[PDB]
C-alpha cells in the first residue's frame with residue numbers, strides 16, 4: 310500500500326512562489342522522498358531529497374530557489390521567483406522495501422506570461438515531391454502564447470477541408486508553442502489553382518500566408 | 523562525469539520481447555542499485571525494477587512476471603528484458619542511479635542521475651523509413667519535410683550539426699495511415715541565400731535510414 314499522492318495540477322504567477330505537496334500513505338508517513346522535474350518534451354531531472362526531519366539536500370547544480378520541507382506525512386517542494394521554465398510536471402518518488410514508487414505527478418502552470426503572436430511559414434510542394442507524384446503544403450506555426458491556434462486552408466479563396474492534417478500545439482525551447490498543418494493535394498490540384506492559403510487564428514487575430522504554383 | 527545512456531530497438535512487435543541496455547560512463551556501476559523507469563506518452567512515471575548485481579533484484583509487482591533485469595560489469599552496463607509486450611508497454615524507458623549499499627549493510631538512498639530515455643513503440647506495423655524533401659520559398663526560412671515514417675522518432679540536424687541557432691524541428695503529425703511526418707526549419711539571413719549552403723541530415727534509426735537533403739530556393 311505504498312502510495313505517494315500528488316494533486317494533478319497547480320498554478321501560480323510569474324515571479325511568485327508555489328508550494329507543491331506529496332502525501333505519503335499512512336503506513337509510510339516517515340519516509341524520505343525525492344523530487345524530480347520534467348520540463349515539457351524533456352527527460353526527468355533530479356531536484357532534491359527531502360528527509361523525514363524536514364531537512365533537504367539539492368542535487369548538484371540545482372538552484373536555491375528550489376527548497377523542500379516536511380510536515381507529518383506531507384512532503385513539500387517550494388519554488389520561488391517562478392519563471393516560465395518552471396512549467397513542468399513535478400514527481401515525487403520514494404524508496405520502499407524492495408520497491409520504488411512515484412507519485413502521479415503535478416503539472417505546474419505559471420500564469421502571467423505575455424501574449425505572443427504566432428509566426429507562420431507556408432511552403433509549397435517541392436519539385437522532388439512532385440516527381441514522387443505527391444504534393445504537400447506545409448504550414449508551420451511557431452512562437453505563440455497562449456498555446457492554442459486554429460488553422461483554415463483556402464484555394465482561390467474557397468475553403469479546403471479534404472486532405473488537412475494538423476498537430477496539437479506543444480511547448481518549445483523559447484517558452485512559446487508550435488504546431489504544424491499539412492495539406493495533401495495531387496500535383497494536378499496544386500497546378501490548377503492560382504494560389505493556396507493557410508490562415509492561422511490566435512486569440513482572435515488571423516494571419517494568412519499564400520503560395521502559388 | 524557519471525552519465526547514463528539507454529539504447530534498444532525503437533520498434534517491438536506485440537507479444538515479443540523488448541531488450542534495453544543502460545550504459546554507464548564516468549564511474550563504476552558497483553555498489554549501487556540501478557533502476558528502470560518508463561513513461562507512456564503523456565502519462566506519469568512508472569518504476570519497473572532495479573538491480574544491484576551482487577545483492578538483489580526486484581521489480582514492480584504489476585510487471586514482475588515479465589521483467590528480467592541484469593548487469594554486465596565488463597561493459598559497465600545494465601539491461602532490461604520485458605517479455606510478451608503489449609500496447610501498454612509503448613513508452614520512453616529510462617535508467618537511473620538508485621541507492622548505494624555499503625559493504626557493512628548501511629546504505630544511502632538516492633535517485634540522483636537519470637539517463638536520456640529511449641523510445642519504444644509496440645506495434646504490428648512494419649518499420650518504414652522517411653522520404654525527405656526540401657522546403658524553400660529580414661530573415662528567410664528553409665526546411666526539410668520528413669514524410670511517411672514509422673515509428674517515432676527521427677532526428678534532424680543541419681549542415682552536419684554546424685548549424686544549430688534558428689533550427690526548429692516540429693513535432694510529428696500522425697496520419698490516418700498510421701505513419702508520421704514532420705518538418706524541420708532553419709531561419710537564416712535573407713542575404714545568406716547565396717553566401718551559404720543548407721543541408722538537412724535526417725536519421726531514422728529503426729529503418730536505418732540516413733539521408734541528406736539540400737534545401738535551396
Ligand SMILES: CC(=O)N[C@@H]1[C@@H](O)[C@H](O)[C@@H](CO[C@@H]2O[C@H](CO[C@@H]3O[C@H](CO[C@@H]4O[C@H](CO[C@@H]5O[C@H](CO)[C@@H](O)[C@H](O)[C@H]5NC(C)=O)[C@@H](O)[C@H](O)[C@H]4NC(C)=O)[C@@H](O)[C@H](O)[C@H]3NC(C)=O)[C@@H](O)[C@H](O)[C@H]2NC(C)=O)O[C@H]1O
Pocket residue numbers: 339340341342360361362403404405406407408555578579580621629630631
Ligand atoms: C527480497 C528483497 O528484495 N528484500 C528486500 C531487501 O533487499 C531490502 O534491503 C529490504 C529493505 O529495503 C530498504 O527499505 C528502506 C526503507 O525501509 C523503511 O525504513 C524506515 C526508516 O527510513 C529510513 O531510515 C534510514 C535511517 O535514517 C536515519 O536514522 C537515524 C536514526 O534514527 C537518524 O539519526 C538519521 O537522521 C536518519 N537519516 C535520515 C536521512 O533521515 C535512512 O537511511 C533511509 O533513507 C530511510 N528510508 C526512507 C525511505 O526514508 C523504517 O521506519 C521502516 O520501518 C522501513 N520499512 C520497512 C518495510 O522495512 C529503503 O530506504 C531502502 O531503499 C530499501 N532498500 C532496498 C534495496 O530496496 O527490503 C526487503 O524487502
